[model samples]
Target: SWELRVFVGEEDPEAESVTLRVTGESHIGGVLLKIVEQINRKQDWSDHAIWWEQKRQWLLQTHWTLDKYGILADARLFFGPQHRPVILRLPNRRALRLRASFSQPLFQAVAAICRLLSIRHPEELSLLRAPEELYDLSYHMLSRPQPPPDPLLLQRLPRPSSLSDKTQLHSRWLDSSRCLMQQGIKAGDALWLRFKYYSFFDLDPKTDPVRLTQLYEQARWDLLLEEIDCTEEEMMVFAALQYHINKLSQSGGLNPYGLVAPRFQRKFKAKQLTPRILEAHQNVAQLSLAEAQLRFIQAWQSLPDFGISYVMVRFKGSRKDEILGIANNRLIRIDLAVGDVVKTWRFSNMRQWNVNWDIRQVAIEFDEHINVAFSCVSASCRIVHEYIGGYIFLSTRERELDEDLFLQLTGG
Candidate 1:
């Protein structure tokens, strides 16, 4: 009878398969000595595979497949940053890219922690290459040394008790996100990203990386960005719109005439109609300026499908400080703009919720009465697109909308 042996880590006894690990010299010695001692004791050597987990790293059997003989079982080993071996199938560069991109936000979370702990820049952290520094970081992350986890971060983590229900949802989101990233799905195209943004408060970005990664692995999803459920045409249009806006804003150019920013859609269109500052009164005090901006973006993305009935509450306050109050008065103007366009209403203060103006009456009053001639001294003249007020739309025929007349009236 011939018996073949394989070495595995001695750390975690739960590893019942062919998992192996090697730490420092003592760890290797101890593993070998244990095998020797077992042999000396005349232990029954069954066909059970060897495994171990020590210092939080899983190890598997080094070599030996019983059936295949003379096959020189030279297993190709893949080592992660912590010298931990990983089992992978196929060429892994794309896999790594897909994973890295999908979980790029996760790395951002980790990088942020590194920044907080090491006081380094996030951009610098991403480009970091020194093996020793990375190893040190891996160790530090594993050991949870220095400062304890932030209370805010701990709150954001999935509660130990709530894991069972969230496991599936978490898996779904990650899998979808990864597929979307791999496929080069645009943010507008991947509604899942928007959904995740709405449902999950950027849990990874705002939480610890160690916890985030653990959550990621347990979800059992492939990290390729191509699996997003959206059509290419729809994706391209939305993505283009974002770029168009970004370019307009970031570079020195006017935004396309009718394009509205997300802030305008959310705050100006949605919340401006309400009499109360509900969100600001509730959760805004806890948010940083950056977090507030994030909240604004998310809220804007989730806006309800309703065209806003805007009331531009303008004020005639000659005083500068008082002007803002009149501008923001919740109850008076239905649409605010400069000059005395008929049907335009002004407000006295923000305190009064009662605006006694009749909108239908104003439409009748302004019928063909406000078409004033336009003249401007500046040669670099521009005319903003004017909303067709109820009266204008009611009065003008499409054929009557002469470009010359419009240009003359608009000072263009």
Candidate 2:
């Protein structure tokens, strides 16, 4: 008889162990059946795989007796997820002995390496078939002005071209650890991964125009919906950019930016399109639709609120409305009419915040400053709460998600 200890699943490093006592004559296949019976998963015998750790090989012939596979006293075996050969698409293909029998998903690995969420194309690229090719590169070259994104397409689009096999993007993922109480985003609601959350250094249009396009559309719709809530002049500037997109992008190739084009026909008035907006739009007239879209987003990217989310709120019981501007490192209170930042609480100096769901009120307690409670007059408190959480996902320019900064963002 021999005593054996087996750890289940790919998480064997810390997963609980199951011990079984068996004799030399005991069938290995029957041993696996008993373990599966304990788990109560009615999956077939194929799912109940075996891995011998000491030998670094799979005990595939489980029908054979334990003694046949040299199962000595206190043998160790992994009870699930036999290693799979994961291909690393490097300069030369390499194989990785991965313990992923669906235990860890493709996205889990994507998260581990920090990839996905391109600047642009899921469907446009989808139309083109296969391999790790970013088809947009070929589409991008005939367009963008010159050097910057041209050399980028051929060799660069695939990856950063690291000496190491895996090219990973290091993003500020601090807030992902927390749930979506911030935006009050429940199930079935898809969260947009605008370029804002990712590292700006990694912003390469040739690599992922889809991610960038998605980001542009997200911001553009915010402008169209009036969710941005900016000054009339600035708001019109947004309208101008959209008009520029509609005029140019509408004229040409693929129309990758069609969905974000001008306000559905009748809604956009020609008279509303200002001279200055069109004047600026012409600066990139020579560039292609894709480049112009990049140019369009880059123009507004300079706006102060371009990176900030605003919620209209008021001091408790006050008739005067104020703007609660949400930013990565701070909470801003702006004059609703003037659009000027009247007051601000740095997340660094901030203590904590609380939200009263029933009455839709929120209060912020800052260190050394007087605490203020806001009544959700125009927008609901849930919006404000979610905005804070969304803002927290951004990393500070000084460091990549420093712990102190993380505490400040998550204080509430």
Candidate 3:
């Protein structure tokens, strides 16, 4: 009899060990099938094979006995696609690039993607030197320590979706994202980086005739700029054009641009549009400022934690005097920058919160009627309301929060 521990995919890189139990098998093929069945019950995918670490390849012969592959007691196995880990050398010398491997859980896979995308801090992706450290994070992930809900935009999680369902969806999104990352990897990194910005536009060049023309024109402009050795000001014009194009696309104002144009052809010739694009980009510095602010809002809203639909942050007046941050179903402790003053609050402490559409402000009231109100700039307020409304409507279940007030404020 032999005891073998099998890991479904990439284990903690430092501790290449198993999470599940070991199957004591006297026979080879039958034991393999049993292990497959166990794994199958957990994951829906059918095509999975054990990549014998020592063999440095997949155990292609499914029927081969454990003895044939030199499988002894406590032998470790990776069950997934054949992996050839590659070291991604980043452009920055100070930044250490990691080996892109997809054999891990969805969270870890996302961490890798976030790291690669330059969205996450390098410290977050720590070196896997200690065994206990992995266990700590692993435990944190499994244990959901979510904070309490927003007092203003109060509602329940969707009923059809359980915590497990959210977990599965989160996993699926990361998996889909990973596939995109892998595609990016196979393509050159420079091209992939360019593609990332292009992805934000979401305009299909092949399908949209206008986009096709834009692509052609954009390429020509790139070459022209290269020939002229264009200044930073000229570069800003190109950046501004790309920025506004996406903005117009989202607002459904791209009809004149050919995507929504009545005919297959553009309303204007490529040469005719160049001056207009350049004109829009003329105020490169001012437009760049607006673009930066918009990008910040967009990035903050797009975070995975934001999708969790539990956390919300309300920025104060022009000076951003105060911030009211909330997370549902858990304690929230925010340390002040000035001193050791830690503001700890949760659902239990919150009395109620309300939003005023006219003034574009939110008021949160706690015990003893302690209230704080923050007025947002029109643009910022609009997005804030939109996010809150989105959360209220998109959430799977009805919440206990003040929904009626939210609907009134948002005019929903």
Candidate 4:
């Protein structure tokens, strides 16, 4: 009864939408079959995903008639990898399916997910592409085929929160200033929702179940994967906290195996690790789920490694193992043998920082201290550079942060 308008990227204005004639079929059956034979064969739109501008999606179900998804008569059909589908792995242990243009700003993608997941503060949180570079073993959990996302996934996802929630928070993995295509994002990528900035202001259990749950789980896995260095006692306690959540909530989406990787697990006696966690898990049997989650957040927050991402590094002269910890507020130098903070540098005090690709060294100039310079042990200095840039971006507040200017400033 009508025509279909097929187009690419969500925000591109110059590209024209192609009009197509819909077959006279009563059911929505095999517009999918039609796409293969008619659209792909005739147009350059191969491997493109389609989402009719209705409140419904019907890409794969051939049986569902037009009647099932309401009368979506012919609407705009998004047709390109630019409006590609992405799966977001949430801290709530659920995946969220949404479509966005790869050319859209990363912040737009963040805003969309936050809106769907009912997250209020998009700035405090960040989206990270999963399981790359062995960042953490547990990233594997996010990489595995995620369980079906939100219940209303097939429904027209509402437009994201207002632009007010733009990419205010900065992360190396998910930059708000850059487009996804340039950020090296591909279609159907899974982005993990993680907390980039630590804020204790809303730790109250009653405040936001989503926020606290994310803080608890993110901190838990950070330890399980040994992303943050902590005392053996701290590890023991963390294990128990995790066990309690795993027991009380029993999120079916959780990986069936243990959270701690083998390398981290090997550090403790196999016998010693279990009883401690189970014992603690038992102690909290009387605690409510929210209370247990709260305790876990508190314990993790107290650690020196809280909100820090560390890279093993070699100081200009010293060869003994040391790590440079990257965090929201400061940079820390830690002695691996002693596991103590040897030095700290504040981002506020940072006068200048540079990464020499030739030397593969990161040097930071401080207002009150000498230049701190180091080379990554096995990792490249770009890791430190990105971390520094991202943190600085997070701390920066300006009246205008044009994507183009921000890109050039960040050397992206």
Candidate 5:
């Protein structure tokens, strides 16, 4: 019963902005019949199609926009050059700012939205936990541009004193949007977030569409209000990224039709962890263990200085030496000689700690005694990476999963 529309352009008046009539059916792809059938079994495609069409039209007809310069500005400051490259890359608008600014925007946005909602629907907004969908929709609404400027923006501009309820309200969002918002969070923060929780949900149709949709909206709204309460200190960081990331690019790579130009990918400006993560086709040839590990490190390490957190190592081999040799008390080494950790996890200290106290240092030393058929000896003692946090989950041979593909049968 809801829809979304997005507009693209330089700073423009909300009233004059074109109504981006990108309908949900079209956005979700023309599979209304199949999707409805899948969600509610026994529901005929024709019956649902009619209703879906009407809902789609109503949503498209509605026009919404505002002075997004503030939001965009925040995005650019927190995201740096990574802003334009991954705007929609976030779960929601609130997340977009929190993860980008580390609760900077979340604090401000949440404070403003909550204050307004509290005034409008005192009972509903003040409740411990609003419906998830409502929260998400709130985030969407709060994020839109308006003439008076976002309440959250107004909350952040003035240097409010400690006694300022506005300032206190803004600071309140740090904990709620913890996944995306929080002080000191940067590009690396987001990358680690993805690595940690990206796989938490299945891509299958196992999720309940109705409930999931509701939660999605609620999440957005909750994030918006959280942003409103952000503090000045938090906003400084957010502002930095908003300016930096926006000047970088336009397309949020990996979106529906985001740009993934070779030059763009190669540019030191943007970021692409996993090197087109999940993008490689299954039919494509697979990389050997050594190659994958090496590439993984390279990919992880290659992330922009501020864009990526700690690199993770996942080893699945029986070779005792291969695994142990790569281990280190402070750093996880892979294929390193001298009996250490083979595949280990090294989290970045940037999140919870610092380099001095966190041990953000990495080294790989190769041994000469043990002989191997093929290995990387030239760059034996190299600084593979440096970080103080992260984990390494190793699945062993016994855990080897059976093939669900035809490749195993063909032994390709």
Candidate 6:
């Protein structure tokens, strides 16, 4: 008996091999017919035939026996429309060019190459569809804004009128390699291809990994990072800030609003419409307000120096009076009424900050009991929030202070 492995269609080179056991006396053509029929019932298409690559031909004569056709055990046979073909031209021992006439479907062609590369899972495959005119080019060529100079000519190169058939195969290979981590597939040639086509993937040079193992490892680390409410260091910083602010509140002589920091809660029950503030969190910006708040604090902890500092005009809570002050890592409120810095609060001392777009004022809570609204002449609440928020990031001495823990976190 002969055990023949069969593949259906030219699209999947790594297609699961279908095993057909036939007696040595069986006619090759008859077996081909039976297998084609079986595959059709489970898949698509008719008018197919079995092919062998060594002979570079199909099994056509029904009368030919398996022995007569040189069919042996463990040989591979391609089953699909006989007309489906990929013509590879070897100009020299080193150079290969494609010369085929048919237009194969893009996704199928990619899946076929991915299969060839041993990427078995469907989720492991991906396709980067270029515009129709440019679709024919390989990922190596189309990924470039413009083609490079022809090595032989050494002059500015003109774009090709069309891409080679093999370019489609190359394009698919790169796409499938790119999304392997998303599918939990083992690294094979896909990992090497991802590294080879790194620029094509438009990966961030600073954060993106160059090696496949590093890529998956970093991806998992980032995913785990997202699962937690906050990092241990972040929680510690929050507690310390809360403690210091509470102590300052108790030592107060003339505490406006009797403000003290709120207790650490899972969610803030305040309506603070700081869209930009939310946007600042790269990953959690699109999440719900309550969900994003937690991520935002974690995001803040990862910043280079927290944020920027700037001076802006603001309105004191009393009498809608205007005051100009320098917000340097803290709110330095200057009372033009007395020409002195009457009140100053570190952003660490603030309970919460909220934006009131309707009244064009930003209400900053020092504690549950005390809330003060700061406004600008333009009646833009967003501006006030942005101003204070900017300083708040600057409040972090993670980079500037060079404290032991800060140094460790910042790699200083």
Q: Evaluated with lDDT, which candidate comes out highest?
A: 4
lDDT of 4 at 286: 75
- Candidate number that wins on lDDT, 3 or 5: 3
lDDT for model 3, on a 0 to 1 scale?
0.36
Q: Give the lDDT ranking, best first.
A: 4, 2, 6, 3, 1, 5
223, model 6: CA deviation in Å? 58
Q: Model 5 — which ten-residue stretch has the worst lDDT?
A: 122-131
Determine the C-alpha RMSD for candidate 6 after optimal superposition of all C-alphas.
26.9
Which candidate achieves the best TM-score against the true structure? 4
Provide the TM-score for each candidate, comma-separated: 0.20, 0.43, 0.26, 0.56, 0.19, 0.23
Candidate 6: worst-modelled 10 consecutive residues by lDDT: 87-96
Q: Assess candidate 4 and give its TM-score to the true structure.
A: 0.56
What root-mean-square deviation over C-alphas does model 1 reach? 28.0
Better of 2 and 4 by TM-score: 4
Candidate 4 wrong stretches, greater than 4 Å: 1-81, 91-94, 130-176, 199-201, 229-236, 246-286, 312-322, 334-342, 354-363, 373-383, 389-412
Q: Please give the ranking of all candidate structures by TM-score, highest first, separated by commas.
A: 4, 2, 3, 6, 1, 5
- Give Cα-based local distance difference scores for all models: 0.25, 0.47, 0.36, 0.59, 0.24, 0.38
Name the weakest run of 10 consecutive residues (lDDT summed) in model 3: 190-199
Counting only residues 3 or more apart in sequence or on different chains, how many pairs clash (N, Cα, C under 3 Å) in candidate 4?
3
Question: What are the per-model numbers of colliding residue pairs?
Answer: 22, 13, 17, 3, 77, 1
Per-residue lDDT of model 4, residues 132-192, tens digit only: 5222224334322223233232123332231111111222356555556555666668877
lDDT score, candidate 4, position 328: 78
Those runs of model 1 whose alpha carbons end farther than 4 Å from true positions after fitting are: 1-4, 7-29, 32-245, 248-296, 304-412
Looking at model 4, residue 249 earns an lDDT score of 52
| Residue ranges of candidate 3 with Cα displaced over 4 Å | 1-29, 36-48, 55-57, 65-68, 78-204, 208-230, 253-412
Q: What is the lDDT of residue 92 in candidate 6?
A: 10
lDDT by residue (tens digit), candidate 6, 324-389: 333344666655557556776765678767766677667778855666766654223433453354
Model 4 local distance difference test score: 0.59
